[PDB]
Design a protein around this ligand. Structure first.
Ligand code: Z75
Ligand code: Z75
Lengths: 389, 390
């Protein structure tokens, strides 16, 4: 019920990703690794790059094993090319174990590394079905569970600060927790509600209803999951299928109509600023996503505040204004419940029982009048019809 | 062709540079000069050097004028230091005029002169903005135009042989033409298509699309011009920005996958050889570079063959094999359309109208199945966004 050794082992922020420290090779080479539930390859920079101040040096690891095979991974945005091999891997603030895992040594990359993110690699936590080059390349977590007695589950508490963190601040601040092999009760309040993992490739789930300030978006629920809905710590924004995005923005605009914002804001490209402390949180609506429950004809909902979907960013003039970007974007690859959404909750990736749990995060940002919530149950019929084929 | 006096006035090859004969001083001192559209200083060896069998002797020129100032010029590779002055200059196989131009007398150099190139100086044909020490040192072409009636335009036809030229052969062979003040129609076939000179410093242009055997490289066009794209007769290879180079090599490898070549080949360092006459040109893809057109939302493309991007080199065993080096290299200073690319086309540097024209070269190397090409127009949107800004 408590895992003090792993609590507060994450750093970072939604816009640049959350990462955990890991060591690779013998002697141990320390590297910061992006936690990504949206992909399945473990890969690390292995050659100089302008944004990296350290990288994996295979020639210095006595336990490095060359698989003599290339690997190419194009993400939704960004991509890298590398060389496959295996080596011994550990997580300093994780289970007291050492695993021999597959590692893609990144030799070329395009819009993958982020200037100032402080991470040098990526930890794909999803399933083998989407690993590159194919499903025979065992993902890290699979190796971890197979080689140790660590329970087949991990949970994430991503903590958004609610305000901008400058370069030095984000390096010194605790960004959250990744509890490997368990659930720590101090990271959430209330009850955990579970939605089934529909299929083991991405952490796929099924959304059955969407509300903006209690008002039903009223679309055929299959639209919400076209062509899939996933939980992805490796993507900043809540991304919604084109048709759903258009309807959601029209509704959020209507709810917040007492103030008008430029088109660039709604396109997620330009920031909007308010005098310090005056952000009109109350004019923006809460967003509720209903998810399929574990019991037949039962669903539950998670409710998000604008404190989650408006991402804090520092003003161009470094002024004292409080500024934000609209963290909801259009998608052509299904719904993506990104980092800004996960920041409101403690999320349990219960691989053992093929389900994902959600509970209100003990570190979510809110105000004196509203809070994020995870509530249920609700009677909902034909939820399987909401899934797209 | 209306400029017969200047046709065939160049000699040399891509790997060592193409040069034109010039004279400096009174009485005239004959020197061979590298034609370089990638720099803007006119400089000549002016002191003994192991690779020079002649040099400018200022004390023998009655018209020499000392500017009492030193000059230092570091190139992308290679460098020299010298002393500035002016003197009377002419081009024997050029316009029939004599001009007083600035001349940097090279007194020290490092990896600049090339053993066996047969040239003793360099003619920077680009603009004053990049002249050293600063833009106040008027480049040769600017002087030429200001002092005479020669039109503010020149054109280059660089002719690669398609095979290795030994020392004797390269000295006797015609390497091309530099038409000063005009366009000679006998040097190209088809139509001339023009791309705007984006800014007058280097001969900067904007590439808007790239294809390998018709397949779109599919990169944000800004990547193709990061941090600039220039036409440079003073660089052998087509040089591409790091990310573009990586994508291009991956695509060229894919297209030519029926044969595997060593990493050293793709790094442009080692040659590959085939039995005499059997070079598999057909397995290598053509490369098309689309350039911004003169009309809004319109582009055109130039297409080069492997006969352009594979540079002929003699085998280490001087055997009868036909050998080549991959003449495409990675750059950290933008795209450089070097000599191997220019060899496929007649290139018109229309300074007067701030544009560069391209037409298929009458001397480009090809085979019975494919030829280089310059074609258009193509509808292309937001081309201005393809240009990079610091
Ligand atoms: C703008 C920089 C990145 N960024 C801010 C920091 C988080 C984003 O918010 C962002 C935006 C978009 C539109 C896409 C992605 C995106 O592809 N993420 C990847 C992980 C990633 C993180 C990163 F930091 C840089 C990257 F190159 C990539 C995730 O595995 C995606 C990948 N998909 C494609 C995929 C499918 C199957 C197997 C592998 C990849 C599916 C959903 N899971 C990320
Ligand atoms: C290896 C011997 C030379 N060589 C084979 C024969 C052609 C090459 O292919 C080659 C390779 C590289 C990587 C760079 C250069 C290079 O700097 N060229 C110079 C001219 C030159 C020719 C030569 F013959 C020997 C030389 F020292 C130099 C050109 O003005 C470049 C110079 N830049 C730097 C610059 C910028 C502004 C003002 C002056 C110079 C900009 C692009 N314009 C040439």
């Amino acid at each position: 019920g408590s895992f003090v050794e792993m609590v507060d082992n994450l750093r970072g922020k939604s816009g640049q990703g959350y990462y955990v420290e890991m060591t690779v090779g013998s002697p141990p080479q320390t590297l910061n690794i992006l936690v990504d539930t949206g992909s399945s390859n473990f890969a690390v920079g292995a050659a100089p790059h302008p944004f990296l101040h350290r990288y994996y040096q295979r020639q210095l690891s006595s336990t490095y094993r060359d698989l003599r095979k290339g690997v190419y991974v194009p993400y939704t945005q960004g991509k890298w090319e590398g060389e496959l091999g295996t080596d011994l891997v550990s997580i300093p603030h994780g289970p007291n174990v050492t695993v021999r895992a597959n590692i893609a040594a990144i030799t070329e990359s395009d819009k993958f590394f982020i200037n100032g993110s402080n991470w040098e690699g990526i930890l794909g936590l999803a399933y083998a079905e989407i690993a590159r080059p194919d499903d025979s390349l065992e993902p890290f977590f699979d190796s971890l569970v197979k080689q140790t007695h660590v329970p087949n589950l991990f949970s994430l508490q991503l903590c958004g600060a609610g305000f901008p963190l400058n370069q030095s601040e984000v390096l010194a601040s605790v960004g959250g927790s990744m509890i490997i092999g368990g659930i720590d009760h101090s990271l959430y309040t209330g009850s955990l509600w579970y939605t089934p993992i529909r299929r083991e490739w991405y952490y796929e789930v099924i959304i059955v209803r969407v509300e903006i300030n209690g008002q039903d978006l009223k679309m055929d629920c299959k639209e919400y999951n076209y062509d899939k809905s996933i939980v992805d710590s490796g993507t900043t924004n809540l991304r919604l299928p084109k048709k759903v995005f258009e309807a959601a923005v029209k509704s959020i605009k209507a709810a917040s109509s007492t103030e008008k914002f430029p088109d660039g804001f709604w396109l997620g490209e330009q920031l909007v600023c308010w005098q310090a402390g005056t952000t009109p949180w109350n004019i923006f609506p809460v967003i509720s996503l209903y998810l399929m429950g574990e019991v037949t004809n039962q669903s539950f909902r998670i409710t998000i505040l604008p404190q989650q979907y408006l991402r804090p960013v520092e003003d161009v003039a470094t002024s004292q204004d409080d500024c934000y970007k609209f963290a909801i974007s259009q998608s052509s690859t299904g719904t993506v419940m990104g980092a800004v959404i996960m920041e409101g909750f403690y999320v349990v990736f219960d691989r053992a029982r093929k389900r994902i749990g959600f509970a209100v995060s003990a570190c979510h940002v809110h105000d004196e009048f509203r809070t994020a919530a995870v509530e249920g149950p609700f009677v909902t019929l034909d939820m399987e019809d909401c899934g797209y084929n």
